[PDB]
Structures are given as C-alpha cells and as structure tokens.
Amino acid sequence: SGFRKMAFPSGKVEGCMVQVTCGTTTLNGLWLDDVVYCPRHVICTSEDMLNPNYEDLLIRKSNHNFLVQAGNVQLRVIGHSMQNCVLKLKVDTANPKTPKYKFVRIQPGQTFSVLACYNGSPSGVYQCAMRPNFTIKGSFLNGSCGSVGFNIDYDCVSFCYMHHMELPTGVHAGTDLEGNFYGPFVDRQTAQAAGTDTTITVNVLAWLYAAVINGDRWFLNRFTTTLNDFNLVAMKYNYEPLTQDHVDILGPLSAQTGIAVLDMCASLKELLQNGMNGRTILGSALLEDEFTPFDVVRQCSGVT
Amino acid sequence: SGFRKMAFPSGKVEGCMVQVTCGTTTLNGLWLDDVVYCPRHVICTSEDMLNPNYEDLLIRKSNHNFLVQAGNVQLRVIGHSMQNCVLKLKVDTANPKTPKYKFVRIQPGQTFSVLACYNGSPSGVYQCAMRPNFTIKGSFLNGSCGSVGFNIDYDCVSFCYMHHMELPTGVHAGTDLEGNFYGPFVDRQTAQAAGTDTTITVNVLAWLYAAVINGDRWFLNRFTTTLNDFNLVAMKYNYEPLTQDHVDILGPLSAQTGIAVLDMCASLKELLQNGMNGRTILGSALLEDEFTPFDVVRQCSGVT
Numbered sequence: 001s002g003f004r005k006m007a008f009p010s011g012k013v014e015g016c017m018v019q020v021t022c023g024t025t026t027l028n029g030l031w032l033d034d035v036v037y038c039p040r041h042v043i044c045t046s047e048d049m050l051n052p053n054y055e056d057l058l059i060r061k062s063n064h065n066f067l068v069q070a071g072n073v074q075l076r077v078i079g080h081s082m083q084n085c086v087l088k089l090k091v092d093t094a095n096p097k098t099p100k101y102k103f104v105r106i107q108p109g110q111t112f113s114v115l116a117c118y119n120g121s122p123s124g125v126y127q128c129a130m131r132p133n134f135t136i137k138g139s140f141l142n143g144s145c146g147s148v149g150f151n152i153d154y155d156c157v158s159f160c161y162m163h164h165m166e167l168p169t170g171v172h173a174g175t176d177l178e179g180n181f182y183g184p185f186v187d188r189q190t191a192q193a194a195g196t197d198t199t200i201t202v203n204v205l206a207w208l209y210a211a212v213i214n215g216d217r218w219f220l221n222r223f224t225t226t227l228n229d230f231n232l233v234a235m236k237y238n239y240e241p242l243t244q245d246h247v248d249i250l251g252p253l254s255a256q257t258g259i260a261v262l263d264m265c266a267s268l269k270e271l272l273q274n275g276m277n278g279r280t281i282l283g284s285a286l287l288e289d290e291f292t293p294f295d296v297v298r299q300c301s302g303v304t
Numbered sequence: 305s306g307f308r309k310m311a312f313p314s315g316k317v318e319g320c321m322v323q324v325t326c327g328t329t330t331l332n333g334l335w336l337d338d339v340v341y342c343p344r345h346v347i348c349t350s351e352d353m354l355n356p357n358y359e360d361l362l363i364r365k366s367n368h369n370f371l372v373q374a375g376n377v378q379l380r381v382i383g384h385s386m387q388n389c390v391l392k393l394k395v396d397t398a399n400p401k402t403p404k405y406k407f408v409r410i411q412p413g414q415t416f417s418v419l420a421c422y423n424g425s426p427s428g429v430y431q432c433a434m435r436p437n438f439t440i441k442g443s444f445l446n447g448s449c450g451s452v453g454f455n456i457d458y459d460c461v462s463f464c465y466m467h468h469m470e471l472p473t474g475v476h477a478g479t480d481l482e483g484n485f486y487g488p489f490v491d492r493q494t495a496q497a498a499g500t501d502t503t504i505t506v507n508v509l510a511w512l513y514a515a516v517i518n519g520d521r522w523f524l525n526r527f528t529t530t531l532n533d534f535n536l537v538a539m540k541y542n543y544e545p546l547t548q549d550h551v552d553i554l555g556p557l558s559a560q561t562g563i564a565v566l567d568m569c570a571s572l573k574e575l576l577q578n579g580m581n582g583r584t585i586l587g588s589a590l591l592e593d594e595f596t597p598f599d600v601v602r603q604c605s606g607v608t
C-alpha cells in the first residue's frame with residue numbers, strides 16, 4: 001500500500017544522454033543508435049533567439065562544429081540535419097547502451113517521466129503529465145534543454161518529449177522526437193499564449209480509485225450522477241468533459257473496487273462543490289490529476 | 305524554474321538489483337562487489353513470521369538454498385551470514401555494474417530516493433523522507449522487500465535504506481545496510497507502535513524558500529518572530545522545534561532570497577495559524593516537508 005508520484009527507472013535513458021555544444025551553447029542530446037537528437041536552438045546565440053532564421057543559422061554550421069561528448073568520450077559527427085525543431089547528428093559509433101526504443105507522440109492528459117540533465121549528465125527524475133494545453137509543469141533550469149520525457153513498457157523506452165524552453169509564465173514547452181512542438185509553441189524568445197488549461201478528469205477519478213484501494217475512503221458518499229449532470233459540474237470547475245471512452249478506460253478500476261464510475265463521479269462532484277473541508281486524500285489537499293488509470297493499476301499491481 | 309518531488313537518477317542502483325529466493329519466498333537483493341544484501345525474512349514461511357527464530361531458521365539453510373539471479377544469470381553463493389536483520393550472501397562474481405558506493409545511516413527528516421523493485425526488476429523511483437518517527441510513507445506491494453533507498457553525490461551512491469515491511473497502519477519500515485532497523489521496529493508480523501510523528505520544520509521552511517525562488521510569494525508577510533515564539537507555534541501544530549543548527553542550515557537559502565530565517569518563520573507561523581485560505585504553494589495545498597534545504601539548493605542550482 002501507499003501511493004506516490006512514481007517515475008520510471010531512468011537507467012535506460014541515462015545511458016543515452018550526451019552533451020552537445022555548438023559555438024558557445026551547450027545542451028543535452030539523446031544518443032540512440034548512430035544518431036544524436038537535440039533541440040535545434042543549440043545553433044543560436046542570444047541575439048538570434050528573438051526570431052532565429054534556423055535554416056540560415058544551420059547553413060553556417062558544419063559537422064565539426066557540433067561537439068558531442070558521451071560522458072568523457074568524444075563522438076565523431078558525420079552528418080547533420082534539421083527535422084522540424086530537432087537536429088539529428090549522425091555519429092560514426094552506434095550507442096552501445098541504446099535500449100529497445102520507440103518515438104511516440106503522447107496525447108494531452110497522458111503522463112511520462114522526465115530525466116532532467118545538465119551538460120549531458122542526469123541530475124534527477126520526476127513524473128509529470130502533458131497538460132490539456134500541451135505545456136508541462138516541469139522543473140528545469142538553464143542547460144536543461146534536450147532533457148527527455150519517456151515511458152517504459154518492460155524493456156522498451158517510448159520517448160515522447162524533448163525539452164526546448166520555458167515560457168515567460170514558468171511552464172515548459174517542447175517537442176516529440178521528430179521535433180514537432182506539443183501545442184502552438186515556437187522555438188523563439190517571444191510571449192506565447194498557452195491555451196486555457198483544464199483539470200484531467202479521467203486522472204482525478206483514477207486517483208480517487210487509487211485512494212479507495214489504499215484506504216482513504218472518507219469522500220465516498222451515498223450519491224450517484226449521470227455523465228450529463230457530472231459534465232455540467234466539470235464545465236463549472238474547468239475539468240475536461242468525461243466521455244464514455246474515459247468511463248471505459250476506468251472499467252478495470254471500477255471492477256477492482258466495485259465502485260461504479262458514475263458513483264465515483266458523484267463523489268468527485270461533491271468534492272468539487274464542497275472542497276476537502278481541511279482533509280487530505282493520499283497525502284494531498286487538492287484533487288490530483290497527474291495519475292492516469294494505467295498508472296494507478298501499474299502502481300497498485302507492481303508491473304516491472 | 306518549477307519545483308518537483310525529484311528523485312535521483314536510478315541507473316546506478318538498477319544495475320545492483322537481483323532476485324533472491326529461499327524456499328518459496330522471493331524478494332530483492334542488492335549486489336555490490338561480491339556480496340548480495342537482502343532482508344533476513346527471505347528465510348521465513350508464513351507460519352514463521354509471527355515470531356521467527358531467525359538463528360534457527362538460518363541454520364537449516366545452506367549456500368545452495370539461496371537462489372540469486374541477476375536478470376537472467378544465476379549467481380553462485382559461496383557464503384552466507386546474518387548481520388542484524390540483513391543476510392549477506394557472498395557470491396563468486398563481483399558485480400561488474402557496482403557503482404562507487406557507501407552505506408550510511410540517515411537521520412530522521414533527511415530525504416532519499418527509493419527504487420521500488422519486484423522479482424529483482426526495477427518498477428519505479430520516488431523521493432521520500434525518513435519521518436521523524438523513523439517510518440517512511442512509501443509505495444510498496446508484496447515482493448517489494450529488499451528495495452533500497454539511496455542518495456547520489458556525483459558518482460557515489462550512499463545506500464541508506466532497505467525495505468523490510470509494511471506496518472498494519474500502511475506505513476513502511478526498514479533497516480540501514482548493516483540491517484539495523486530505523487525506529488523501534490522488529491521483523492515480526494505483530495502490531496508495532498510507530499512513535500508520535502511530527503512535521504519536519506526545517507524542510508517546510510526550505511520549501512517556502514523554494515516557493516519564493518520560483519515566484520510563489522503570496523505567503524510573505526510584514527512580520528517577524530523569535531526562535532522561542534516560533535517554537536511555541538511549532539509545539540501547538542506538532543512541528544519539530546527549530547534550533548540554531550536548523551537556522552544555520554537555512555543560511556544559504558536565506559542569503560539567496562534575502563529573507564531572514566526568522567522572517568520566513570513568521571510566514572510559516574501565519575500559515576499554521578490561518579491555513580492556506582484555499583490557495584496553493586508550488587502546486588500544493590498543504591505545507592510540504594519532504595524537501596531538505598540541500599534538496600532545494602540542488603534542484604534550484606542543477607547539480608548533476
């Protein structure tokens with residue numbers, strides 16, 4: 001028992017982190033097979049970043065200008081290319097530590113672990129959610145660019161995120177591993193509107209199920225509701241509308257606890273309307289939305 | 305910017321996890337050099353656990369009865385010994401993945417990362433604190449015994465905890481790597497009183513400094529207090545008394561923010577007496593005590 005914001009073991013990803021330097025800019029790269037992936041803004045200078053002409057900046061760069069160092073060893077760069085907002089540096093040596101991997105574009109509301117790195121060295125690992133507005137509320141300082149987000153299914157790492165920047169609001173933005181930004185963001189130092197965010201309803205319900213499994217049951221009530229009635233409350237409280245696909249994803253947790261999804265919706269409805277009254281659920285005094293139904297089952301079943 | 309419950313990168317510890325089987329019990333072992341460390345209760349059966357005679361149970365066991373498997377390879381056990389509540393299985397092969405390491409006994413209020421494992425396979429990593437009453441509020445299921453707690457200083461892993469059991473209250477208990485339990489706990493299936501717990505005051509103050517650094521400043525007020533006045537409030541709210549050693553440890557954060565420790569104590573005093581009034585600090589609606597002053601500086605400075 002117990003419920004924690006658990007990250008995947010980061011070992012397989014640690015073995016892929018390298019340092020990429022171009023001119024005076026240093027950031028992190030991901031070395032998979034004979035390719036190092038990194039944010040394309042590694043080729044910029046402070047003057048460039050207000051509106052960089054990436055095509056022109058990259059034309060002035062040659063293979064030998066990209067300094068890639070894996071720990072203490074230097075990699076020889078034999079090709080370079082820009083794909084969307086990422087640079088792909090072909091190296092002459094395949095990473096011997098390359099795990100089985102996939103590149104995936106995650107959906108908003110899904111979760112992943114971030115391995116925060118500086119100068120190609122891992123510093124920490126944390127679990128987070130891709131917000132409905134495509135930002136991530138991460139923890140990143142100068143030099144963290146190129147740190148990646150991932151999920152691990154047994155021996156396969158699915159890389160879903162590469163960190164590109166911090167918005168003026170203090171939230172984070174990045175791309176999939178093909179360099180396509182999540183959200184409307186652009187790799188420029190400009191004011192960028194992140195859309196209206198909402199709370200991930202399916203995750204809050206999944207986390208209420210995790211609470212019941214772990215013994216925190218005070219919020220269970222004698223009520224039920226309908227998808228329509230629940231969605232009127234979710235609208236008022238800036239929660240994502242609950243669909244039958246979400247109810248279906250919550251099926252296993254509903255079966256495990258014997259609490260019908262709409263009955264859990266009625267508990268959530270009461271917590272939204274009345275608050276927690278100074279009480280806590282799984283050590284939290286707010287409604288947590290960073291655990292998916294899959295995460296709750298995985299944590300509550302011990303998948304390795 | 306941003307502040308997360310960040311765990312150390314678990315790679316160096318993942319390479320040390322093995323599966324230990326004795327009879328029908330399987331749990332996790334830590335393979336460092338030519339020794340595998342595991343909880344001594346691996347030699348018990350369900351009937352034994354109410355009050356096991358460990359010396360007698362171990363006498364019936366021979367080297368060949370301890371099945372140690374590192375991934376898919378089997379280790380040959382050439383010696384066994386019990387030290388306090390741990391078993392030390394001498395194997396004929398030194399772990400090639402043994403990082404530079406130390407065994408340390410952490411103090412209550414200090415933090416560490418746990419690499420939760422099942423059948424010798426890592427499943428997840430999370431950050432937690434050793435509670436003032438020597439329990440840990442972890443997330444562990446059946447088979448998690450032998451999972452370890454650690455801290456990493458550059459290339460050196462300081463192992464501080466090995467998981468032994470879940471108390472009937474749902475909190476966790478374990479030992480240092482010499483097998484000495486933290487707290488009054490014994491490795492028996494019995495009702496065991498965990499002492500009165502308190503909130504880690506120095507950590508809550510460190511986390512308020514992390515909040516100021518990251519932009520959450522609403523709780524700062526026009527007041528100050530004394531160590532004596534603050535300690536009367538800390539007594540009433542079951543917080544650890546603040547000492548000058550704690551103020552001294554908070555020196556660097558006080559210098560970074562320019563907010564005197566006693567002025568931050570006055571903000572904490574007001575939050576204890578008035579609550580958060582439906583507001584949040586670093587995404588939390590309660591006062592967080594699982595970040596030490598060292599953790600706050602490390603996260604806010606990017607140590608790798």
Ligand SMILES: COc1ccccc1OCCNC(=O)c1cc(=O)[nH]c2cccc(C)c12
Nearest residue numbers: 041140141142143144165166187188189305
């Ligand atoms: C405005 O910056 C960019 C905009 C578009 C593209 C790239 C931009 O920056 C690239 C460098 N950024 C970081 O390394 C950075 C990332 C982060 O998440 N937090 C920070 C906290 C303090 C200081 C810094 C520099 C960071």
Ligand SMILES: COc1ccccc1OCCNC(=O)c1cc(=O)[nH]c2cccc(C)c12
Nearest residue numbers: 001345444445446447448469470491492493
């Ligand atoms: C009463 O148990 C012991 C007492 C003293 C000594 C050893 C004891 O158990 C050894 C086995 N324990 C676990 O593997 C276990 C650990 C844990 O943290 N959570 C669980 C959640 C559900 C089920 C189980 C079995 C666990």
